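Posted in: Structural Biology > Protein-Ligand Complexes

Title: Requesting predicted complex, flavin-adenine dinucleotide in pocket

I'd be grateful if someone could produce the 3D structure tokens for the following input. Sequence and ligand are given below.
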Amino acid sequence: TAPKTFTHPDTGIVFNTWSASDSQTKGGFTVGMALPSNALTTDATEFIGYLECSSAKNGANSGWCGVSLRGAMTNNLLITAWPSDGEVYTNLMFATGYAMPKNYAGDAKITQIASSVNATHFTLVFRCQNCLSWDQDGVTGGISTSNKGAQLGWVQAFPSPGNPTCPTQITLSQHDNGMGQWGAAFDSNIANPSYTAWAAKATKTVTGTCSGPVTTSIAATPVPTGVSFDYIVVGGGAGGIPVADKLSESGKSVLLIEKGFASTGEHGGTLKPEWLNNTSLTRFDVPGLCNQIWKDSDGIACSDTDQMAGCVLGGGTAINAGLWYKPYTKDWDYLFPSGWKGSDIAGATSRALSRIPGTTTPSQDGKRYLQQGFEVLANGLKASGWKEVDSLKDSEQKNRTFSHTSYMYINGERGGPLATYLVSAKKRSNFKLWLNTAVKRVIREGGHITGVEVEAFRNGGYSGIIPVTNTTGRVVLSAGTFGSAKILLRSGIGPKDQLEVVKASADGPTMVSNSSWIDLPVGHNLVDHTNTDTVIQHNNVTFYDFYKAWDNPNTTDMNLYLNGRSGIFAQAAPNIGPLFWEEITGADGIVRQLHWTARVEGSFETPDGYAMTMSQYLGRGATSRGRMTLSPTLNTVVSDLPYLKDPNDKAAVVQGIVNLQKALANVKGLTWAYPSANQTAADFVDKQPVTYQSRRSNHWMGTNKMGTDDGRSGGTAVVDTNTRVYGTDNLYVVDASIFPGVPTTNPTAYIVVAAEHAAAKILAQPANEAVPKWGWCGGPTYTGSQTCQAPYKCEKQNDWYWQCV
Ligand SMILES: Cc1cc2nc3c(=O)[nH]c(=O)nc-3n(C[C@H](O)[C@H](O)[C@H](O)COP(=O)(O)OP(=O)(O)OC[C@H]3O[C@@H](n4cnc5c(N)ncnc54)[C@H](O)[C@@H]3O)c2cc1C
Ligand code: HEM
Ligand SMILES: *[C@@H]1O[C@H](CO)[C@@H](O)[C@H](O)[C@H]1NC(C)=O
Ligand SMILES: *[C@@H]1O[C@H](CO)[C@@H](O)[C@H](O)[C@H]1NC(C)=O
Ligand SMILES: *[C@@H]1O[C@H](CO)[C@@H](O)[C@H](O)[C@H]1NC(C)=O
Ligand SMILES: *[C@@H]1O[C@H](CO)[C@@H](O)[C@H](O)[C@H]1NC(C)=O
Ligand SMILES: *[C@@H]1O[C@H](CO)[C@@H](O)[C@H](O)[C@H]1NC(C)=O
Ligand SMILES: *[C@@H]1O[C@H](CO)[C@@H](O)[C@H](O)[C@H]1NC(C)=O
Ligand SMILES: *[C@@H]1O[C@H](CO)[C@@H](O)[C@H](O)[C@H]1NC(C)=O
Ligand SMILES: *[C@H]1O[C@H](CO)[C@@H](O)[C@H](O)[C@@H]1O
Ligand SMILES: *[C@H]1O[C@H](CO)[C@@H](O)[C@H](O)[C@@H]1O
Ligand SMILES: [Mg+2]
Ligand SMILES: [Mg+2]
Ligand SMILES: [Mg+2]
Ligand SMILES: [Pt+2]
Ligand SMILES: [Pt+2]
Ligand SMILES: [Pt+2]
Ligand SMILES: [Pt+2]
Ligand SMILES: [Pt+2]
Ligand SMILES: [Pt+2]
Ligand SMILES: [Pt+2]
Ligand SMILES: [Pt+2]
Ligand SMILES: [Pt+2]
Ligand SMILES: [Pt+2]
Ligand SMILES: [Pt+2]
Ligand SMILES: [Pt+2]
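-- Reply #1 --
Done. Output follows.
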């Protein structure tokens, strides 16, 4: 009621002010008025206002202020204020009821003088012309300044307005932070001779912009207090899912964090073509729909990499063709160290094949479809003396061999880890699943990981830090070849220059200190199958589209799938003809594996129908390696290609094609589109560019290589034979990134088998125990526990020695 006098320090203007108490609102609220010289006698039509308002939390630019001029919200002119960008915006509103007020169409105008914004308050000094009398529709109101005083209402809110930069279009909910009104009465200072000079300082103006609605926000859930896990696995995928289940059989608490959203039907996925609406099936569930990922991939695939990777539950297993194979045991013999050889891995290979047996006849009616294309090549090959084997039992015949396509499917829908391992895991109470949640890095005190930092990627997901239960807790990185290498780098584990790139980013202030960095060759030894395409034609080739089966599917086949789980839709797009294999000895005395897959599709210039493309995959035995690195904002890039470096790698690719022509030489009516018949094989291979767009197989591997040679000693291995990161207590990597090289076939089978094997070694490892005072807690050769008994701290003594002190 009684006015406080307040002189503005900046502009020099004297206000009458009225404030609210600390109970009425928090952060505080103050109004002020400045009137003309004659104002205490005759009614003034204008005034100079002052607003000091509050931002409590949401606290940078947020909240809004209001004033009602005869004080009730209704049938009076409202003035509404709020910060955005660091400026202050206002709007003149008029409310009839106690719903959201409209814009005031009338002669009232606000022009600014001075403004302030900071973490506590936002200030405004403005000038209101023609604001003391109003009309809207049929409503007359006003206040007489000679009374002497006025009724004033006020409000304050916690959230900032929607469309906060476009005043005409703003969106509000009811005022949170407080409300009330005064009996405010005037005195000496509200009428000043200096007034008309004060109102010429109204020159200032603010720039609004409309631009439409906003998609940016991502509201998140903060991480539960007093919760921890025995194992935390990062990412659902070929490695992630199977390892999380097998850990969860132990009874220990397991959490699985995944950046993606729900993928298949069973797990709550919604993405479908318009003709799957009336079922629970989803585009990831139908095999014949699997190639649409090359047409519309948005939000399905990772934005932080220059390559194709699924960010969805099941990762690669959700977007791939589903090809499944009993692993060739020689691949383990050649690639892996001891404990991972063919004989050690035999146990876990049967366990994986029991949960996911795979099938050569995905259709549940019992036989195959559009096999005429398959037939041409199949018979043409045994004519040159090749041998049909079943790729699901004697896996040992990879030389001059073909087989029927073999999938991971179960009941004619996409099979694999999502349909088996992740179901039997969800049934358990210890198991928990978090989606739409990105892991930024692991948190660690020295070589011991305490917990992991998460950031909500999409809405459902979580922000903040989850701990592992202490001293025993373990983290497993399953986030894929590029994803896992990235997490390590951001965790201060990797080559120096890459860590510097991280330190120089927006991650840097919060990043681990470099006193604790671990030098490992993360990102080195990048490797991929080397893919090369050839094209043939025959009149026997039956083409099926599959791309417009999205929109306008064949009705006999749609009804055949939906009703019976049969028809062409139960096998992979595109229709995948025979798989065949050849091993080749080079002049360097290495045997390089070839893996051919044939699908009935057109390639570079050869139109679809009559056409079969034959993709050669250069596998195990290839010597060439690349490297992965980080962009300045921490995108993963392939800066060194692993394709056709060694001249003997290229020799084998060329050989393969020659041998294939000789073996298809006697077949009726067989064209060769590529290489065209005027062209030699070597000439063709050489015209193919060696570039990841031309030659990549999407089988990326090896960026944290497993080996017995510690990286910190100038060896090549990031993780040891138990899949644990050198220099660490609790930190493991289970996924394609540990493979020292590519296997014969498509890697998903090899990865799940490998996840089975690792979860057994991990579990077999003795519990971790804190190091006593004076004990050895670290340095470049140290393999033991990295954490001290409390209060004691790990401290560095030499350049080579850390002890608990
Ligand atoms: C286009 C394509 C086609 C393929 N076709 C075949 C095929 O026909 N046959 C075959 O056998 N294999 C195929 N694969 C290859 C095979 O799927 C991959 O090698 C396999 O998926 C590797 O599994 P992974 O667990 O190592 O990584 P992924 O399977 O990619 O799983 C990684 C998971 O971790 C999650 N993640 C990543 N970053 C984070 C983060 N920081 N925080 C939390 N979670 C994160 C990802 O979202 C993803 O879900 C294909 C792959 C692709 C990309
Ligand atoms: C959509 C946003 C808004 C909603 C839902 C809203 C709703 C309300 C409701 C329901 C009441 C009191 C209930 C009652 O009297 O029974 C109220 C009171 C009030 N409102 Fe509004 N309001 C909104 C925006 C504003 C604006 C823009 C102003 C003025 C700047 C404002 C100023 C007031 C004041 C001063 C009071 C207390 C005095 C009174 O009862 O009139 N509100 N608000
Ligand atoms: C923010 O501004 C308000 C008034 O405009 C002032 O009271 C407060 O001290 C300022 N905050 C800081 C941190 O200076
Ligand atoms: C399928 O569902 C989507 C989801 O809203 C809808 O947009 C589409 O029209 C539906 N198609 C039908 C019912 O044929
Ligand atoms: C082409 O198809 C016909 C029947 O459709 C078959 O008799 C013939 O053997 C096929 N050609 C080859 C090369 O298999
Ligand atoms: C693969 O088969 C070819 C042809 O029979 C033969 O020349 C080659 O030595 C074989 N390689 C191996 C490793 O058996
Ligand atoms: C660690 O960082 C500081 C600057 O942040 C730098 O001066 C120091 O040399 C770094 N340590 C090493 C070993 O380079
Ligand atoms: C749809 O597929 C069936 C085979 O199941 C075929 O007989 C029919 O002709 C196809 N329809 C069209 C329009 O091609
Ligand atoms: C587990 O945590 C507490 C507090 O964080 C610590 O004092 C205790 O020593 C830790 N466990 C062991 C075995 O030291
Ligand atoms: C985290 O918080 C969100 C709200 O933004 C919830 O919708 C979600 O269920 C999760 O618990
Ligand atoms: C973290 O805060 C939660 C609030 O949900 C409590 O339940 C818990 O005891 C801890 O203080
Ligand atoms: Mg309130
Ligand atoms: Mg494939
Ligand atoms: Mg770049
Ligand atoms: Pt006076
Ligand atoms: Pt505007
Ligand atoms: Pt929980
Ligand atoms: Pt869609
Ligand atoms: Pt060998
Ligand atoms: Pt469930
Ligand atoms: Pt913590
Ligand atoms: Pt149906
Ligand atoms: Pt080379
Ligand atoms: Pt591609
Ligand atoms: Pt074991
Ligand atoms: Pt070290």
